[PDB]
Write a protein that binds this DNA or RNA. Structure first.
Lengths: 159, 160
DNA sequence: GCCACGGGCGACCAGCGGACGGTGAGCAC
DNA sequence: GTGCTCACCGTCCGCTGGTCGCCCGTGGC
């Protein structure tokens, strides 16, 4: 498998141009990973093995073997909060992307910018970020990062 | 010395004391209740610290229980008798009548264990072979990992 | 061609879930 | 004690989930 093109900040309907991938692509990867999970579940059930509820190393292995190693653990864990903000607050995810673009910032920056509206979101639902993940059917299958929980708790602690 | 080694289990009628240097089955089942309480504690603690919050009885929860002076709630034992506990949660009457029978015949815990599998497999088959589903349906079972062996045996009954 | 800009993902690790049988307690006579 | 019953639970192991920072692609010159 060839090393994949770097991501760049994008708008909801906007294409990436050069040797670069867009954010809508990024989000699609999570959809694909969900489908691969579903496959792995069906296979496991037919073999009579344990059936995973989350996107595990097993599911990554499956995706890779199906020729999609670009869906790998490091990357997926890296941009989860972004994906979460997209699933939970479409409008906000979008308008933020717009802004980050207008200012001309990198993915690394956009990442950080995604944390804060998510923390706001958690605070509005009794600080229960883990609850938010378990509520949305497309987030249910992703482990909630330590860092997000921490940052929610620190906003609880300071404000 | 966080605990002296515990008395062996013996087959028991629902509510029989289990006289001797021996523990009964209702005690066995109580251990799972205690483990659930310790899980609940660990959850509350984690939430107040802002750490990750477990949904199942993990090594962390066992460590907690041990530190609270209940190392008799340990992973090997708990994983050993889960299907028994599951049958108890899902089919009280059956769990009971089975215990009665195993007693009347005069069997050891090791035997009663095996006898517990089969009504459970029947149970799974009646809910589209989804034993993992059964665990996730009952609010007292959702906190326990489903053993490989139970899944296998459900699948073999599907196959044979 | 040089060389910095920045991120995709290899690789390592701490600890988990699983699993077994070694030790050691239990018993009726 | 006797010989012997038999299960509690330490202990080890193969991964997993998390982590992070290199090596490599990429770009303006």
């Amino acid at each position: 498998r060839p090393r994949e093109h770097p991501f760049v900040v994008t708008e909801p309907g906007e294409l990436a141009r050069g040797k670069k991938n867009g954010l809508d692509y990024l989000f699609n990867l999570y959809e694909q990973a969900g489908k691969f999970l579903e496959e792995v579940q069906h296979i496991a059930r037919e073999k009579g093995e344990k059936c995973p509820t989350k996107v595990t190393n097993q599911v990554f292995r499956h995706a890779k073997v199906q020729g999609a190693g670009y869906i790998n653990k490091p990357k997926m864990r890296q941009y989860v909060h972004c994906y979460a903000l997209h699933c939970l607050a479409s409008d906000k995810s979008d308008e933020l992307r717009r802004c980050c673009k207008e200012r001309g910032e990198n993915v690394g920056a956009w990442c950080q910018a995604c944390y804060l509206p998510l923390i706001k979101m958690a605070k509005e639902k009794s600080w229960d970020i883990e609850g938010l993940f378990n509520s949305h059917d497309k987030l249910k299958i992703w482990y909630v990062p330590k860092k997000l929980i921490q940052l929610c708790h620190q906003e609880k602690s300071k404000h």
